[PDB]
Amino acid sequence: MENLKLDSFLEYKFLSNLDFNPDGSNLAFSLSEADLENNSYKHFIYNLDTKNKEIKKLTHSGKEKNSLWLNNNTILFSADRDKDIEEKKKLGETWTIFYALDIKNGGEAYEYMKLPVNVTEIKIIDENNFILTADFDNNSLNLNDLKGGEREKAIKQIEENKDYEVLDEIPFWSNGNGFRNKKRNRLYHFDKSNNKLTPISDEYTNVESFNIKENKVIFVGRTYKDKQALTAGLYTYDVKSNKLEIIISDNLYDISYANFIEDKIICALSDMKEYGINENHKIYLIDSNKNINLLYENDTWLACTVGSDCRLGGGKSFKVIGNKLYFLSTIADSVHLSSLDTNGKVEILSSENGSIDFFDIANNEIYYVGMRDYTLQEIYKLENNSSIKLSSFNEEINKKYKISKPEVFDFITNGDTTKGFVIYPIDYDKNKTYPAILDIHGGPKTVYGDVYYHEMQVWANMGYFVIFTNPHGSDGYGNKFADIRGKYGTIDYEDLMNFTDYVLEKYPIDKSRVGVTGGSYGGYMTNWIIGHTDRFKCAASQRSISNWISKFGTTDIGYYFNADQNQATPWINHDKLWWHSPLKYADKAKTPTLFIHSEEDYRCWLAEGLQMFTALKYHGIEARLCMFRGENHELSRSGKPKHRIRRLTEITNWFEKYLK
């Protein structure tokens, strides 16, 4: 082998967009890989034949991801191979060009469609009919329709308007998407036959999800003019009657999935009365007369929440075929693939140890991408609760480099039993003593698992122990285990400190050289940890939360997600919201702390990292902060390659200065 290095992730391959053709013969997917020279990513389109089992590389310029199957022969994708349209978009025009790539009859990609909107997702009624969600600006100048003097007047106004941002609704930006004031994700119908682009959802509605069966659309709708509500409405629309029908009013529940199943509608849904915003959605059925009836009392977040920094892109996590609804659920450190028929029978289909990222089903043949055996993403076919490995995109990674696989064990703390993980240092000697790093998984209701994580292997290849666990608040063990509302920094902080106590005694680690790092919620805990204990000699706080009050007014979810998680508000029990803020305890922090933060991170605003850094510096504590431009919360998982190398370098150099 050879030592894994900081930048070794440049050679990793990431899979996305697993989609079948209607006849189940060919399934398409995309491969992404780092492009260090251009600080971007190359995206290729691939195909596997379901009976030949042969992988085929379809694109080679590196700017194409498959979005849709036109028919069993032809994959459609969006690109920018029209230099005229490209320069029009720079001026302010909105356009999306789709091409077509014959596999059965061959050739190269040829232009199939031009659509005068910027599309976010596309689905197919037939060859000349598509259902659309796309960016829509209520203050758009409509540069496509303008000509003459009014055109040059708009080109200048659009250019000048880049120097401002106007805000008059309480979520004025979204992380990963920039400023979003008075702009919505709107649903459209496009008829290629007559080039007619027909709106479905109105001007103020954010379409969060949509599905189609034949000529009928079902979508999720959040609508607001000044304040986004916690509830979403369910709506349907037919592309022949042009009738919109309110299925569920927009002030009852927050729905996560809705689709057609047989002659009625299945829907994940919750009124958030028991466990708040993040309550696990139960699955109901909606009959013809719009009655809601329980079908299966699920107690899981219906998604793969196993953390990793070796993913780029995604696919389907829900599917409806026949009478069964196939879904995902993270159960402990792993993901399950289960079904649910219209009778309520829950069969479990895949309870393997690794993560299931996304999947597709065609003729009761199940294909998925996942991370098994602590290896990177590969395509597996599912047969009788066991997986056959088809692709070999990342097989040499584990054979080329020295990977230290975690030691999984059960850990008891605070009346419940969770998972504990300890990664040995490379070339481990029981006669020596080593330093360690405690990694706290970002997001409260997420999961650490036996899944290849690059940043941990990097430090294990440099002589570090890397330990981590899933404290109270993580996903996996239902709403009860995840409920830490009003308990931030208590039973979860105990869980982490109890885990650190157990590890530094059971494993041979120098207690005097222990670091701690974490992002998002993990960055909050790092700021909390350094303000309550002296046991870590250095810390790294990334995209963190330091001031719940300051975070209330500057976060894309802050004005409602803070009140739900801390049971407080800058005006109702302010002392509680301040008690849970790590900035309050910054005058007792003595631990040197590096701060990673992104300027366009709107899930955790720059103010949070700026405050803890200033506080430690005010009290004469060594500190450091690296601000990343053009990046956001997703820097560690999907940022530009150089900015990922810079983040990994800053974090790796800080431990080296204080732990070696």
Next chain:
Amino acid sequence: MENLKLDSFLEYKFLSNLDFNPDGSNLAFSLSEADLENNSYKHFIYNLDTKNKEIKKLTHSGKEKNSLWLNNNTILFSADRDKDIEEKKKLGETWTIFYALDIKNGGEAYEYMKLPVNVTEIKIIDENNFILTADFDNNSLNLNDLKGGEREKAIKQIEENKDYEVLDEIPFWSNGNGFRNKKRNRLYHFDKSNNKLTPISDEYTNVESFNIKENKVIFVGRTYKDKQALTAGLYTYDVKSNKLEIIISDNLYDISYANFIEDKIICALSDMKEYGINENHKIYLIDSNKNINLLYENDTWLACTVGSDCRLGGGKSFKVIGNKLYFLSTIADSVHLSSLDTNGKVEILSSENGSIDFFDIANNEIYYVGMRDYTLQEIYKLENNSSIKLSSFNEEINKKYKISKPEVFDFITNGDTTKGFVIYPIDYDKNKTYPAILDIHGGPKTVYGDVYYHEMQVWANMGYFVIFTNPHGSDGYGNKFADIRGKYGTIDYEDLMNFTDYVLEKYPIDKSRVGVTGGSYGGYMTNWIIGHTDRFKCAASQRSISNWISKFGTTDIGYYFNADQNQATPWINHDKLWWHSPLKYADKAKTPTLFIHSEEDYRCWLAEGLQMFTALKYHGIEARLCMFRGENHELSRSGKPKHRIRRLTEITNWFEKYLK
């Protein structure tokens, strides 16, 4: 008589850099005017022959400000007329080219000097020796000295470094200067004969003031590696012996002015023990034994603090000549010009109603630029406490547009008699009724005066009353009147509301239609007002403060100034610091409020504006926020023309929408 329009300031002229030549024969100065088409400002160098008062324009390209007098016939200025140097600056090289313009012999400017640093201020000893302060970076790659392969790697490293910012000091940025982490304002001596540039201040000292007599240098020092202190250091440098000498340590006093006088040193100091950071500086005399003897117990902020938006640049507020020290002092409504001889005697040389922006003296001849009789900037000569107007760059403005001059009266409140102002609406009728606008000046210890203020005149020309005053905390009545430490929102809020009630009774103002607005501390009070009263039907909060614990960690001055003004701290009496924050009362805010804020404002950072807006939108109140890119706290005074028009238009349409 035409109506003054919103964009009428595009026709104003602004003077700066009033500077004598060594024999008092000529007076150089710069004129500045807005260039809307290029969204910038043109600058021209003028001359004034002191014998017959002839005004001459000397440069015409629009990119020149006068720096020094090379001799009695030549002005020295910096510009960019070398395209090779211009492109090397874009790559990373530090350069400044100085051109010489012979006013007597004629011709155009010719290149005189080239210095491999970015110069922030320059002074001349003789025609071959100069004292500089210039930008210095402790992490500079020194691209000027690099060649070959190390150059191409440094160029790319400089370009890639633009994506990040590294912080490891508690003042890491300065308003109007961007990020300043580990960058200092360093003093240099440049010998033009042998092209030697020699440092004087060390690699970590911020030089904030310096003066020269013969071949000696006096300068002021702020030195820090991790935390800028409140005290400054006074040192001296001889350029022949290369001798540096500490005459006051940097841990004793804060100093505002320091200069050579006769055979000793005159200096403005203070131990901030009686009134804090903003304590008025006494003027002391330092003998050759480095003993510091009191010369005059000055009780003034030795500067011009009369606010106005019709200035661009500045000049000299101090001048030592013979045995006297001529200085400015805002006495209450206006700016005086006094003198102080080494015997301790104070003479009042100017005590007129307007403002004195900056001056200069030669052979008992005192010229200055000032705003008198509610007219824009003009050059005046001062003789026997009365001024003679020598320029008319803006004389047509008051003759062509409808200017409503203020009515000034005495106004007692909270045991002190301050000034009150009311500007009538244009075409005023005694029997009709009008809406009003409250303007609160921005710097806590500054002053509103009988000085042309554009935004006030724009609103009066649209049918508004404009009212403003000087509450407790303002400049112009000694320390005691300016002492609102720990009193933010108490007496200062009462004095404004007492003034507003006074004006609403005497004048025919529709109390139903009264707007309020202000920036900086006037933006804090606007945020304070809407949370503590509903009497204003609409508000406009510019570059405001809303959350003191938030401003502590995210502001160039917040970690020492906020504790000085509120006598609190996020960790010491936090209840008090949270009390003086207007965000605490946002739940009681019912007044629709517009928010003006800039992205690169580091005096009141973006977090303050976002929190008040999100809080008001959270409570169902109408609110609007306009964010300005590329501008800072000085937007309303020196921002780019289009952005100044946008801010004015944003505020005006807000008043128009709710007050009409």
